Amino acid sequence: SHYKSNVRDQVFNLFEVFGVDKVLGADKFSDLDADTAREMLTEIARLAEGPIAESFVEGDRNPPVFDPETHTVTLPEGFKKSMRALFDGGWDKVGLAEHLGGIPMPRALQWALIEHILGANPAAYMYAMGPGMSEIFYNNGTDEQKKWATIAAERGWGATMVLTEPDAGSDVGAGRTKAVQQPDGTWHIEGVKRFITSADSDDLFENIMHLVLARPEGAGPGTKGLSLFFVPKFHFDHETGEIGERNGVFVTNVEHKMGLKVSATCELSLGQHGIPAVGWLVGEVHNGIAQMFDVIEQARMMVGTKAIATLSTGYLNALEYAKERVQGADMTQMTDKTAPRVTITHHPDVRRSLMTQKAYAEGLRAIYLYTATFQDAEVAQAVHGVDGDLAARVNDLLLPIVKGFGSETAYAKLTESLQTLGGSGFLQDYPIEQYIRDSKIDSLYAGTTAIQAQDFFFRKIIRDKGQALAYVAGEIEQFIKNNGRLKTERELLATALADVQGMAASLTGYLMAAQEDAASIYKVGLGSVRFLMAVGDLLSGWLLARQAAVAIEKLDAGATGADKSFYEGKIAAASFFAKNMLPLLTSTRQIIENLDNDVMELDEAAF
Amino acid sequence: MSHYKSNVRDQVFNLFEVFGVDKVLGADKFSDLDADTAREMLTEIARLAEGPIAESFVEGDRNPPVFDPETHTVTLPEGFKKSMRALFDGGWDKVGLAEHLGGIPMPRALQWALIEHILGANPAAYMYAMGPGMSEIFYNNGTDEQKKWATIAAERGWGATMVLTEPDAGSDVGAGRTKAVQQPDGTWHIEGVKRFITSADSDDLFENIMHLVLARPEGAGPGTKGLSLFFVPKFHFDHETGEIGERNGVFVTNVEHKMGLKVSATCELSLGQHGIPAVGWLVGEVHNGIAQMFDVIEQARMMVGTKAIATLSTGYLNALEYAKERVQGADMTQMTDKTAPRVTITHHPDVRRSLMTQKAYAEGLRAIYLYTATFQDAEVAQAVHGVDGDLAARVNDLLLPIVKGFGSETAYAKLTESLQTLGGSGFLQDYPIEQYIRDSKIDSLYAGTTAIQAQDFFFRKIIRDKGQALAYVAGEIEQFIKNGRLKTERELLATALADVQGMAASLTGYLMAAQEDAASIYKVGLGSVRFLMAVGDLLSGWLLARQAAVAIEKLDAGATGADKSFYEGKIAAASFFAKNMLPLLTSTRQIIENLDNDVMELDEAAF
């Protein structure tokens, strides 16, 4: 029962802050009303806290075992039981297209539902991403492939995304797996891929769809030469879906990892065992990296939401421990060594720790839900007044924040959650040490933090001509310019916004200088991650302050009891974050304004 | 080779070229230990560490100790016991031991440099080997008769434990309820249950274990001042010959399952609860337990900080070796050319940023603990600093919570950069960095949590000290600032010194104003950890700048080859640290100047 959920904060964001209930019961969501959405959140949170979280510890302590002669993994029984509870409730089809058996819903609600599985047992959601992948295959496929995608979604096949090779991780375009065209128009895929999540999954599914990047013989270099292929674990009857003979794609190793142990992470060999790995060209066009980024975009959203979900349950575990742990006297009585003992929430450093965890957990929740409000044209129109084109560019801008800032922040603040338990935090008896191990990977897969920061600056700001960035900046500025009980917070946000504008100007300056001195581009690289984290902090502080403004209205109107306590904590979090996290951005701007290439010119031997 | 990458070159640079410890080698207490022999010892223990000690690092984690309830003992993996024997066979469990107990006299600065290698290679091995050093502390606090037993204990290499913590008494040692009942013969029966005792059993490593136990004599007053310290051996023994006799009533009942440091058996320890009394002898036959035990705690806190620093160092050097060989991506100056040559990742700005961050903190932290150690011998402090015994003791006590608190927190945080440098492979148990992270998380918790370190630093080592040690250190920093190639660094150090001065003044004001407004003291608690970390950053930057000043002199004198590369790295690290780490202290000062009690007044239910 490690998993502590926060449906109340989810509903607060979705309805009281962002107004996603504006679209419920109209247009694409005509059959889903606000009551039902709330019931779904409560239901999956209960299921997550129970049967899904039930095997969280077991998956880590009794991890999958690989049989190299069968090329299969065995998963622990309790975890597979958790997977069946997910399937029996339909929770592998959250947000699936209606024509694939899904329940239409705004993406903001879909990711809030998914947060609970990611908090309780995140590898369970990863194993369950098959139907979502089938929908992406459907969207990119020919008419005939759409029929296969429909079967795969209805039968609940598992799925993988297969990019990485030993020499091609961040540099996808270096991959050497090849595709050999056959006279009948299929392809034979030949190569060894590495680190493939869920490439075998015991007997969870009757089939697995591998979506594989490979280079057709004679194609050009880099990512632009790659094509994407549908490579099923088993051949099947294209009309009925009846499972046929084994296709030539075999797991040949399973990694031993720091955490996320129950997610089998696999070396995957294609066409290496005397049986061809037949692949079908997705959409029967050569457009592999663009097609695969439909998948990567979802994976990056998931990984960021995963890290955020994990910090939230980490914080709530730390809080519940702190409420009960008696240790020491109140600081106002520290010299009286017979003073009454107090619970540790009375100690200033513990309250600082807990409010740091709270503000970042809740600010991050607001960030991913805000990001999701731009993932549906109809939601972005109704709740922001933004047309479909700008909505897509804003969503693309925020994804590296969700992924990069989410992963880095959650892992770092889980350090505070563990510390709150004292020595017991180091014990496996409590879940926080597993939270830390399970979440360290989030800064690495789906593109490292450095790759996120490079995407954010070069593709999502510069190539975008800053239009999404300017949009978000204008919303922040509008909040600042708009009661005076938030006057101090709006002043701190104004400074933080000017700091981030300054960082953006400096980095853009170094880029322009690279027209004359190519090495000036290195300064962009040196500051890129700090810039990404700075924008994340600014967004956290702004969204928390928006939450405080709503909380003030609800308190003024007469909130009582648990509602009152909730709203009071929003005011406290927004004020704490503005006063203790935002000012650091000023020093970070000054640091970025003074970057130089000394560290780039230093001989490698001097390190 | 092994996981453990050592840096004797940087240790010798600190000891000789920076701090001048070789000036006392060959004179007075160290008359028969010259500089050549000191260097030989460091090189020899580094090889022992890289060889047989590191050999069981992985095995201790993957095949951890097992509790046997049939015998109330713990069994250790055979490979780790072989590492322990390599330690004993070379006499390294006697490092810095008093000559009359069989030790080789040496400066504490050299002793801790030797110990760093064991802590980097397999830190639990040093912990199990702390027996003879504990016997020396028993000797110094013991009666004339007890001094005879401590001598036997050191000569026989008995293990030892420090036994304070109980389920309800961790940070608040004074709440302990373990009891001592005096017997007619002048011995005591100890009755109670202790928790989290390191090395509480150790298989067949030793013929006896000395437990140093805190307990409250019947009728004594409350808190730590009512505690007494007892010598409680695992076996009774002949006080003249040392021959092992009957089992004493002190038994392990459990072994904790921990995130890391797994091969260090951490045990619940039951005294007098299994049918026979736990006989204890009052140490020094005086009631003075917490003062006596703090002789041990001081050593443990130095060890823990040095452990964290040793672990970051080998983490860094592993990441650096990996980065030098990993090919991935094109040079940033060619990023739009998709056929540009592939480069090793040390060519990427974010990777060089990461590596230089790891390097500067690892080397800055090594300078800090070695600088601290130069104040632990009156003769060294006199010779290398010109400070008398009293001031030297106060400066050492000032710096200990920096070594422990700033060392532990910084090492764990920067190991995140080390792991990130490996990409997805950093998440694999195939590489040692994930174990470095798990093994080092505990360094912020045991031997006093970070909050307790920061409270000790401010309340006891500054305020109670009337700032004398703090003013001495600040004056040394100011003298360096006062004094061309280091002008920018000295300017940044001047800002950082003023920032820490401002922090100290704000927190002192919050404390003194508590006389008229009791809740003012909470702002001290809110700011104390950030202040401890700021002092650590300031010291890191100053010591790095001192190292660069030495490196400039040696480069000007004509250094070549590997020496020149080393010195160039010192100049680069001092400059990077001054420009990228120190400025953040300005924002932290302003944050501390604006702390308020809103987070203290908030209802606990609002969290």
Ligand SMILES: CCCCCCCCCC(=O)SCCNC(=O)CCNC(=O)[C@H](O)C(C)(C)COP(=O)(O)OP(=O)(O)OC[C@H]1O[C@@H](n2cnc3c(N)ncnc32)[C@H](O)[C@@H]1OP(=O)(O)O
């Ligand atoms: C179903 C089971 C899932 C279980 C959960 C598993 C979770 C973790 C799984 C993984 O880790 S999957 C492997 C993840 N690998 C990555 O994320 C790659 C990281 N490297 C990069 O992102 C590089 O920055 C890369 C894009 C590879 C650089 O290659 P490039 O060739 O230099 O890229 P370029 O900038 O020129 O763009 C080429 C085309 O790629 C598309 N594209 C790039 N970036 C994006 C983004 N951010 N969004 C959408 N598409 C993108 C474009 O088509 C682009 O072409 P264009 O510039 O428009 O002409």
Ligand SMILES: CCCCCCCCCC(=O)SCCNC(=O)CCNC(=O)[C@H](O)C(C)(C)COP(=O)(O)OP(=O)(O)OC[C@H]1O[C@@H](n2cnc3c(N)ncnc32)[C@H](O)[C@@H]1OP(=O)(O)O
């Ligand atoms: C042998 C093989 C094992 C080694 C490997 C194991 C590694 C780690 C093992 C452990 O974790 S052992 C358990 C560690 N426990 C602690 O470190 C306690 C953490 N809590 C504190 O430090 C509290 O701050 C404490 C001091 C307990 C508060 O109690 P207090 O009663 O309120 O303390 P007070 O400030 O009034 O002083 C009382 C007496 O204690 C001595 N003393 C306190 N601080 C120090 C320091 N920093 N140095 C030296 N002595 C200290 C004084 O005797 C003081 O009395 P006085 O004020 O001088 O009259």
Ligand SMILES: Cc1cc2nc3c(=O)[nH]c(=O)nc-3n(C[C@H](O)[C@H](O)[C@H](O)COP(=O)(O)OP(=O)(O)OC[C@H]3O[C@@H](n4cnc5c(N)ncnc54)[C@H](O)[C@@H]3O)c2cc1C
């Ligand atoms: C691996 C391991 C080995 C150990 N080995 C030994 C050993 O050999 N011998 C031994 O005696 N002990 C040992 N311990 C005990 C260890 O020193 C304690 O865990 C530590 O002192 C913290 O105490 P606690 O666990 O009770 O946490 P708590 O004291 O309950 O701390 C809980 C939280 O409250 C905070 N807090 C507590 N009091 C205050 C205060 N007054 N002001 C502000 N914040 C406060 C703490 O910082 C922490 O965040 C070991 C522990 C571990 C994990």
Ligand SMILES: Cc1cc2nc3c(=O)[nH]c(=O)nc-3n(C[C@H](O)[C@H](O)[C@H](O)COP(=O)(O)OP(=O)(O)OC[C@H]3O[C@@H](n4cnc5c(N)ncnc54)[C@H](O)[C@@H]3O)c2cc1C
């Ligand atoms: C648990 C796990 C599961 C995975 N699952 C999958 C999966 O299902 N499918 C899949 O396709 N892949 C998967 N991967 C692969 C994963 O996405 C890669 O590990 C990741 O992209 C990093 O690549 P790499 O490990 O080769 O590291 P590298 O690319 O070698 O990176 C090493 C270091 O260099 C830095 N670096 C590299 N290039 C640059 C650059 N141009 N600029 C700046 N810095 C740079 C990186 O930031 C990093 O710090 C998985 C990995 C893990 C660990």
